[PDB]
């Protein structure tokens, strides 16, 4: 008997919470289900926790919010049903989810572009082109800037979907092939200097970037610009085991010419301190030599002179030499020239006088009273100032590359923009430090921005449909965690870090003690663990993350010695001089301010949300793994959207469509009944449906989660029955 059967998604091992199987419900009580596992054991589950399986009619829906059992394994299942038909795009409420097929699919042709022109989301299948077109028409209709927030680690398709957005916009708004290629060739340059191998991804973005596609008031593409945010400069001087420095370093050493190698005095990576501690210098399946060629070509395409290109690589090389400088305490308080080979190599490439540099590194002068005093520094402080020099140099170089790229892109006659945002994703390593807290804070704020945007649209939808149901701002769900990190009163983690940083005698231990004293057992989003003395936990939208406090006081300071700045202002290199002559705040306060400026920008826009994901970690086509997929959906906020969506009345059916499907569940209700609302009510009343589970709108019946599934199950049963139920 087919239609008596009900299925459930369950975890064979609850602690592997994203690995599911399909079980069969056999018994039902007030508050629970009993079901049978795939191998035959019976289990129980509370109805409040149960993940029922949607009837087959729901398989393949284009928007996850149409699912009636809206739950995490059901979401995976729908994504899989579409993926197994080579439908890689699916909506989940406001999100567009894009799953990498790891093979070529011809869905980005000129015939496909044309189908999406002027079509609203509900008239065409899910597609990145559909997202792009709606953004473009909204921009013009509302005279408002747009943002596209696109997630995805390398391998997921984020770069390919960004390219598709740009290609589409150029096709619907171009008159502009040279601009488009210039925009696209920015990414290999920034990636070389802003991406790195971590333990979780071979090509991780360690910075955020907003690409503006600019339009004139008439709607034609008129230019572009790029803005960068929040580059992680700490990686330049230290990498954790098995990770790498920024790509550009390995690209330079592997693909440079023999003369370039000689001219810049460079050996292999493990010859250099900054690239030789992690134990990893190469990435399987990646050729740093080829990538370097790709970088060079991109720089040519976007207008970098050969003169500039050589000075860029001189600074990259200079940083490497600076890193191999070994300070030694010539016995006494101070540090000495140990061996001058690294310094002169750095000074050669930088165009700087070497004797000036070593003096500014170990014996910087700062005004004592109101006159100069040569401060001789010990080896420790000499190394840190050397490290701060490197980090200042890399970050100034990064900002210069951005400025140079923007110079070549036009920005005249801009009226509007459609902006693509690409930021470091939510990340949990084995050990998480201050860098991870900052990244995860950014993502908490970005998810709050999504949630709040969803809220404003849901408020309008319920108002328009005249639905008797109230709900509070979804963004409030994020506020406890955000306040715990960035709050002022009560002070959050970053405020307390700042308060401790001003005392030179503060320590790792005084800082963690202060954090525990403020938050342990007092804030539900914070955890003091029972056995670590150096870690605390924060409950993010994407899960708890444990943070290790070691070195955070030093990480929160970024002083640079003026004598170092003065030294580099004199240099021969045209680029180097720019880094220092174009024009007290802690790192945490900087991070907070830069994030606040990004958020301000985003608040002026109408946002669109694209979530690119990989189906598995083996780059294989036709292979989904729920564990892999659900981790990404948790981190990128799709499962947070589901959490919110499943709480109200997610399923919303035009009355006539409801009647066309379910008229047969009630006597004397015609399939094409004239008064569709009255027929809907007749079906619901005949079925004895609890009226708390639905609301009548002006044009649609709204259902709580699960209720439409039960009606569907009754239809499945009625069709194969010899008479109506008893
Ligand atoms: Mg990528
Ligand atoms: Mg994808």
Numbering used by the authors: 28 to 202, 208 to 615, 627 to 769
Text lifted from the article:
Myosin is a ubiquitously expressed adenosine triphosphate (ATP)-driven motor protein, producing force and directed motion along cytoskeletal actin filament tracks by converting chemical energy from ATP hydrolysis into mechanical work. Despite their specialized cellular functions, all members of the myosin superfamily share a common multistep mechanism of force generation—the chemomechanical actomyosin motor cycle. The myosin motor is thus subject to substantial conformational changes along that cycle, traversing through different actin-attached and –detached states, eventually amplifying them to a large scale rotation of the converter domain and swinging of the adjacent lever arm in the force-generating power stroke. ADP release is key for the regulation of the mechanical motor function of myosin as it controls the fraction of time the motor stays attached to the actin filament.
The overall conformation highly resembled the previously solved structure of a myosin-II-dynamin fusion construct (root mean square deviation (rmsd) 0.54 (chain A) and 0.57 (chain B)), which was assigned earlier as the Dd myosin-II rigor-like state, with the converter in the down position and the relay helix straightened. A twisted transducer in our crystal structure primed the nucleotide-free active site for binding of ATP, with an intact critical salt-bridge between switch-1 (residue Arg238) and switch-2 (residue Glu459), which has been suggested to play a central role during Pi release. The P-loop (179GESGAKT186) moved away from the switches together with the N-terminal domain. In our rigor-like apo myosin-II structure, the interactions of Arg232 differ markedly from the blebbistatin-bound myosin-II·ADP structure. While Arg232 in the rigor-like state is hydrogen-bonded to Asn674 of the SH2-helix as well, the contact with Glu180 (P-loop) is broken. Instead, Arg232 formed a hydrogen bond with the backbone of Ile460 (switch-2), while Glu180 of switch-1 interacts with Gly457 (switch-2). Hence, both interactions in the rigor-like state assist the maintenance of the closed conformation of the switches, highlighting the central role of the interaction network mediated by Arg232 in chemomechanical coupling in myosin.
